[PDB]
Structures are given as structure tokens and as C-alpha cells.
């Protein structure tokens, strides 16, 4: 069975989001709020397919992703340290846990000094 009919009873937004990730999309709390604000806590099939379209984010690219990290790179050198990126990722936005942030940073590189453009390029795939 498909990802929607496995858990349907309507499907909980939170589970729709997980399915979106398995399909290679990247929903944020903004998309969850949008889909909630017009269809409630649970979506019909048709509502859920709108949500997936909502989660395509075809404006996602390296130069859009790096904006916040650039703010912290004063001399626009191109790098930030793991711990810098961890603090950023765990304080602002839809904050990750320390563990989640470190796991992403460790998977991408074994060095402390991280090219955040290449890190943003890599997490897009």
C-alpha cells in the first residue's frame, strides 16, 4: 500500500510531513501551519496532495539556503566551524536538537572548518 493509505482513517499533518520527506521533499513549520489553517489537523487525500505540492519548494537552491550562514561569515570567507553552525541551527528557525545538528555536520565533513555552501548544496539532494 501507498504512504497515505497505510495510515489513513484522513491523515495527520505530522505524518503527511514524514511522507513528504520520504518522497524527497522538505516541509517546514510554515507549510504545516498553512495546511492546518485551511484544512485542520487532518487531511483528505486531495488535501494531502495539495500539501505535497505545497512542499515542493521549487525556489530551494544553494544561494537561498545559505543566507543565514552568510550573515555569520563576516569576511565572506565561505567557511563556518561546526560549533558555529550547530548554535545557529539549534537556536533560530525550526531549531534542531544539538544531536540532530551535529549528526548532519559530522555526516557532511570530518573537519571542523565547514564550507557551508557545499553543505547546503549537499543537503538538497
Amino acid at each position: 500500500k501507498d504512504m497515505f493509505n497505510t495510515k489513513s482513517s484522513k491523515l495527520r499533518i505530522e505524518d503527511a510531513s514524514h511522507n513528504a520527506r520520504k518522497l524527497g521533499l522538505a516541509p517546514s513549520s510554515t507549510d504545516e501551519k498553512k495546511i492546518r489553517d485551511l484544512y485542520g489537523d487532518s487531511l483528505t487525500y486531495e488535501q494531502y496532495l495539495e500539501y505535497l505540492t505545497m512542499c515542493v519548494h521549487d525556489r530551494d537552491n544553494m544561494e537561498e539556503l545559505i543566507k543565514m550562514f552568510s550573515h555569520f561569515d563576516n569576511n565572506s570567507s565561505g567557511f563556518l566551524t561546526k560549533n558555529q553552525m550547530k548554535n545557529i541551527l539549534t537556536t533560530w528557525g525550526d531549531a534542531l536538537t544539538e544531536q540532530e545538528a551535529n549528526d548532519a555536520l559530522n555526516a557532511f565533513s570530518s573537519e571542523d572548518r565547514i564550507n557551508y555552501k557545499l553543505f547546503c548544496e549537499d543537503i538538497l539532494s
Binding site: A20, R21, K22, G24, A26, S28, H57, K67, F69, L89
Partner: peptide
């Protein structure tokens, strides 16, 4: 923007 990065990091968690 940072939220876009975080959304893709969570995407990356699931296999």
C-alpha cells in the same frame, strides 16, 4: 531560509 536548511536536514534523516 535557515528554516529551509532545517527542513532538508530533517528530510535527510529518513533513510
Amino acid at each position: 531560509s535557515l528554516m529551509r536548511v532545517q527542513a532538508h536536514i530533517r528530510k535527510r534523516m529518513v533513510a
